[PDB]
Amino acid sequence: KDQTEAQVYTEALDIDVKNGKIIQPVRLRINAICPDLSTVESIMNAFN
Amino acid sequence: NISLTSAKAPDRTRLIAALDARSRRDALDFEVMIPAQVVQYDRAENIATIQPLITWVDTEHNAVQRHQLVDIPVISMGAGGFHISFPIQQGDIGWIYAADRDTSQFLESLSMSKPNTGRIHKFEHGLFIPDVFRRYTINSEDSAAM
Amino acid sequence: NISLTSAKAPDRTRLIAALDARSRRDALDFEVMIPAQVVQYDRAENIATIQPLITWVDTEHNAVQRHQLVDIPVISMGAGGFHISFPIQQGDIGWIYAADRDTSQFLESLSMSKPNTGRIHKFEHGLFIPDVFRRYTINSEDSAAM
Amino acid sequence: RSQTRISTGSRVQTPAGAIFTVMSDVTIPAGGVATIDIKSQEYGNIPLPVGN
Amino acid sequence: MKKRILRVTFNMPYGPEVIREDLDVRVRIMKAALRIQNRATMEIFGLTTQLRESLLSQFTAWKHRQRQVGREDELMIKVSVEAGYSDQGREQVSRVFVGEVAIVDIISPPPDIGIRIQCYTRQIDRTKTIRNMPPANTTFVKFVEWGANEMGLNFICDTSYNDQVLKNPGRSITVASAILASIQDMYMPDVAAFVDDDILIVKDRDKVIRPDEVTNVNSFVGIPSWSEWGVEFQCLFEPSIRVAGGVAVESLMNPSVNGNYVITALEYDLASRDRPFYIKVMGSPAA
Amino acid sequence: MKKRILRVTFNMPYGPEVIREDLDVRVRIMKAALRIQNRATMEIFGLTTQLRESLLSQFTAWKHRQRQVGREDELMIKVSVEAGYSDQGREQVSRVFVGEVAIVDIISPPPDIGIRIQCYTRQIDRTKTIRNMPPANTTFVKFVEWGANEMGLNFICDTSYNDQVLKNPGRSITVASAILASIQDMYMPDVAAFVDDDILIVKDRDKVIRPDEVTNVNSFVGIPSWSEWGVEFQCLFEPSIRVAGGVAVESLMNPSVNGNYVITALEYDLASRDRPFYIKVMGSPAA
Amino acid sequence: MKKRILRVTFNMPYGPEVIREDLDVRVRIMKAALRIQNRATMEIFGLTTQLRESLLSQFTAWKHRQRQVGREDELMIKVSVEAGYSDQGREQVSRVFVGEVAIVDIISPPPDIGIRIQCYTRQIDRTKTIRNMPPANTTFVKFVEWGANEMGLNFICDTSYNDQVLKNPGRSITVASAILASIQDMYMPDVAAFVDDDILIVKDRDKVIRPDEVTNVNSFVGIPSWSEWGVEFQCLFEPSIRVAGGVAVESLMNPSVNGNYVITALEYDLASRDRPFYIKVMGSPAA
Amino acid sequence: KIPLTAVPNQAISFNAGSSYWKIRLYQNMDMMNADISRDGVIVCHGVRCFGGIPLLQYSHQYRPDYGNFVFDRDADWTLFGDGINLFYLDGAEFAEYQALAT
Amino acid sequence: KIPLTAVPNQAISFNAGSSYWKIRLYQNMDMMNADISRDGVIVCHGVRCFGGIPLLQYSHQYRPDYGNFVFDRDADWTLFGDGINLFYLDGAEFAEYQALAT
Amino acid sequence: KIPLTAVPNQAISFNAGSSYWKIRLYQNMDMMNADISRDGVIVCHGVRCFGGIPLLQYSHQYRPDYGNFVFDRDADWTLFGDGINLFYLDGAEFAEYQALAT
């Protein structure tokens, strides 16, 4: 609107900005060396 | 090979084929005029039960009879207090027409009135015209006289 | 909640619902046959002003009166130079039919003629048939005779 | 003669009858047929000796 | 992490055949308050030779054994759809559609052969005829009751037009399908007549059929907005949403549209291996 | 570097609310010489909560304040669209459409909420009725004049059929919208009747309404080509192009199609932040 | 390595003008056993100014030469399409469509100007009228013969309804095109009447016109599958496939669908510089 | 009650009591003020804001059969939605309110 | 004849002789067995299969005017499609068949 | 005035004077030649082109009420569009010009 009282306009431009920032999921990456076997099949079983 | 419906294989190929199918279906349900017969009649109110005389064809080429219509008015020509009537009884034939809208509220009072319902162009509320067709003998003398 | 129009919320969702709406609208404007009444009539040329006796219903269920039709011909049965006429006057009732095309040029000369305009299936150029319905007394002696 | 009586044919007695017909019937050449009655309400009411 | 359940059931002559969620199945369902019957398009992938032969050959659309001992199942088969969620082995499945197969196709070529199917609700009536004469002079409710008995469906009717006498209501009905069109025609548009699942429902436009089963909705995937008829939004698969039922709406971005609405039309987009698992709702103000 | 100008106005009860070109606005307009009323679809992005409340709640499509003191604006609001260029602070704006909102939607979800709107020209007549009896026996031009007075439009008529007597021309018109269908029906296809902006125009097919305002066209974005009815081409936004006006065509690729043409149909694809800012024209030979 | 052949011929007043396969030409053809006439949409690229001037100006759709000496070619030009393969200079070309141009367009802008064209079979009849009185009281076959003579087409009729008397069969036919609708209307759906190329064919649904020309098909690009009316598959350009002809099907992936089928509808997708060069077939069980 | 918000100048419309109203609230120096519209026709201009004193004063306005509006306490736009409300009473309720008031 | 396959338990449906049949073949210990249906209404259960003798024994079953089924040799589901077949004979052919049988 | 171009052999079609014409122009040895056809029916073959004298010579050809064509100067296909033109005169002014000829 841009002609109202200062604090009224400060109340606006909030809430509206909340409509326009929505958080997407989190991505996590790792790198590792697996020494034994049972860990490998456990991971694959969890994967399936 | 009875096909369960009046559907054709080339339909659903294009839009125009479907459009023609729906056009034919919408036209068929539109009712105007067919011959009919009298089942019951009372001379005192000009209302007669009517049974149409043309059946319905099926995918097996069978014949399905139509439905009787009750309280159908009979036309009695006349105006200015001078009319003509024929002593109709059971089994007489003729023609039946279909009114545009619902006429029951009009038939109660014979004055201006709303349509009762939204049903249009059906034989439920029509008008019966008596006829004899070719069943008569004409004498040789009045071959050219009314 | 008067909705400003005869529209449904479920419409606009699919093509078939829209097609059914347009089909209903196209059928509703097809005029065939409804009861009417006589406003003016001159016995010398068989033309009568006609006012239909069934109104229009709106979204508030109000009644909107129809429009008077002028110079509508009256049917006088007869052929081979022998006809029947009833002395119609103001306030007589009956039925009115609707011609397929424009017949003003035909009524102007009663011979083969070109159609005037492109208007089709409207009560503007029709045909009136008198009737009396159930308004008569029948004597007990002739309960089986013309 | 040859009338097709229908269901729910409502017959009203003078003391608030409001009575349906229970099952359909068709009129016979005699001119008299039998039909059944059920009350539109769930209280105790009685029918008059004559048709109303 | 809850898993989704999508089961499609087929009634072969020998018994039922169930396609589970483990395969690739996509389904779109459209329901509304109209005389036009509901529709469902089905995408099925990975059918083997045995199952293809078992199922696709019964969608014949011709007539066999013209003598027709009985009816219904001796013409077209019936398909039922139920979708839900499973959590910790605990299920919340619910049926969403019942119909009969109408149209067959083939969509994808090898290596993966996929087919498309069209189903409609109460399509068995387009072949069955009428053998019980309709009443001549009667009220609206008795006409509705006769229609319900003729089709063979449990019915509920609740209208302000229950005490109006009609003359010759259905004396020009050829088969059993035009009964619904007759019922809807008389008091359009205030009176809405539709067939949902296997129940005939006739009612006023703005009346909730079950006043005490209002579902409070407060989590929308699709932001609610005005739609010049009421409100319209979208959510995940909520089994509580039905047609003609009510909803209580509480929003965050759009709190000016909170209120009670009556459900008019629905759409379902359920997939077992794709993103869409949704429900779209259009509403009208409650009266 | 000239900039484009695009404003959309709404005649709300408190006053006008103008959406400037600074936001994301897309508009498609279709105009033709027919009885079917013109259409305009708008894409509007970035409306805030206050303005969403102000605008989206007034496209109700229900009826209220039943006493109905007056008509026109007390049913549905009016929208006016004007587009043009601006160079060095000098404007060359022009109006292209007037109509009323009919259909509302929501297109894009957060974080950018956008809506779609359908507007039609002279949609106020689909509710207003006829209260002045049509002439019974008269000529064409007087029927046109009565229709213009009834709808409330300035009219122009120039046909070879101005001295033809009609009997019972309009005795079967329910609302004020079928007057145009009546006018077009009598003398198809030579006589073309259409409503443009606020003017009713009835004319013969191949007559230019303003013979002295022929717009010479020599710069083409869409290469002109034979169109099986005349010619058809495309250009940037030219404020001078109208419906039923004339065009003088000179080409470089296709010099064989130079001549005078009368405009039959039009197109508009105007955007404030996208590539399309165009006009598509189809013409007929000028008699 | 066989090469594909695609020629399009135009019968211009001075003579034929054949667009060879060396250019960019795309054509889609749809044929069926119905009264609705066949269609062909054509894409032509690279036409120069000379050929654009020569061809595009003759699809006028207005009328010249009001004296009208003769008929047919003095209204609209005719197009004939032939497609096939070529190996070692040895050809196997075959004709697939005959029709007249109806609609023109411009599709692609410079630098490559391409046009789109719509053609219909026996569209010349939509202008020609009837000058020979239809038979009053006659059988079916004589009505078909009169219609064939009136249109000007060689006809073949083979129906079980060949000895049925009709009363006033064609007393309400205004032009030469409604003859086919008349012929199809009487005995739907068993009797199918359609016009293919230059032959009028009336027959029962499940009868093969040429019993001894059954084309055995055993190589399908599109895997055969049941499709609610019979079978439906796809192949490369096989000149032997026609409408109403029979096919013998042997499959490998779907060996349960082997049998004899009668062809109902066809589709052609032929291009000279694109992937599609195909034929789609739908069939019904042979009787 | 009527939905309000904390803004020194606003104008909400609604369909209540079988009629269509449009109300306007704005701060004027010391007290509030109000503008009331019905059926698109203006009714009053600048009627003040008092707790318990009904907004519509005169019989040609408040009803043959319509309703009326009243503030529970002297309203200020800072407290709207928190303790300060606007209520609508249909014809019978308003009539009995007036009867009991004196 | 009838299309068959080498599976120990199956069912095939077909429309032959102006009639709708559904047949079931399954191995039961030593010999085969058959289930025959019509109209969707069961006809017989567990018809033992032998080579050269018809499957339908009773007069009210095989025909007023219908047909009947005969296996040329004793059934063995390993050999179907190779040397062992099932044939269908319409009413006249079955009548002359039974005439030739004795 | 008919549009032409610089090609040694061409054919232009047009609809002028309520009639449909097709004209052909081609170089033959030294002079030009023309082929004129109307309504799809050929009129004449090989009329030599000269400056000032009409192309259609004979009364049954040029008009009861049709028009005729004249070249202002002798034809030369390298000059069309620059200094050499072909004009069409409808019946009234053509007959006036024949009157002016003598």
Short mmCIF file of C-alpha atoms in Angstrom, two decimals, chain F residues 205-206 221 223-230 232 253-256 280 284-285, chain G residues 49 52-53 56-57 59-62 102-106 108-110 113 115:
data_model
loop_
_atom_site.label_atom_id
_atom_site.label_comp_id
_atom_site.label_asym_id
_atom_site.label_seq_id
_atom_site.Cartn_x
_atom_site.Cartn_y
_atom_site.Cartn_z
CA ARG F 205 -19.18 -8.38 -44.35
CA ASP F 206 -16.79 -6.49 -46.62
CA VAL F 221 6.88 -9.90 -37.03
CA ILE F 223 5.47 -13.20 -42.16
CA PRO F 224 2.20 -12.58 -44.05
CA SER F 225 0.68 -15.54 -45.86
CA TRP F 226 -2.47 -16.53 -47.69
CA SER F 227 -5.07 -17.66 -45.17
CA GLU F 228 -7.76 -19.46 -47.21
CA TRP F 229 -10.13 -16.59 -46.36
CA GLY F 230 -7.93 -13.59 -47.13
CA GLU F 232 -3.25 -13.42 -41.89
CA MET F 253 9.12 -11.65 -48.30
CA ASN F 254 5.72 -11.98 -50.02
CA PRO F 255 5.08 -9.01 -52.33
CA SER F 256 2.22 -10.83 -54.10
CA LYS F 280 -2.46 -11.34 -34.56
CA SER F 284 -10.72 -10.31 -45.81
CA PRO F 285 -10.62 -8.54 -49.18
CA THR G 49 8.52 -17.77 -53.44
CA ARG G 52 4.27 -20.39 -52.72
CA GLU G 53 2.83 -18.00 -55.30
CA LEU G 56 -1.11 -21.00 -51.89
CA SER G 57 -3.18 -18.60 -53.99
CA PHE G 59 -7.05 -22.40 -52.04
CA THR G 60 -9.22 -19.29 -52.13
CA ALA G 61 -12.53 -20.67 -50.70
CA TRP G 62 -14.38 -17.77 -52.32
CA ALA G 102 -10.01 -27.03 -47.37
CA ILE G 103 -7.91 -25.00 -44.89
CA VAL G 104 -4.55 -23.22 -45.17
CA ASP G 105 -2.19 -21.90 -42.50
CA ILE G 106 1.37 -20.82 -41.82
CA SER G 108 6.88 -21.94 -38.96
CA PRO G 109 8.40 -18.49 -39.41
CA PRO G 110 11.60 -17.76 -41.34
CA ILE G 113 8.71 -21.21 -43.95
CA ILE G 115 2.62 -24.48 -44.20
#
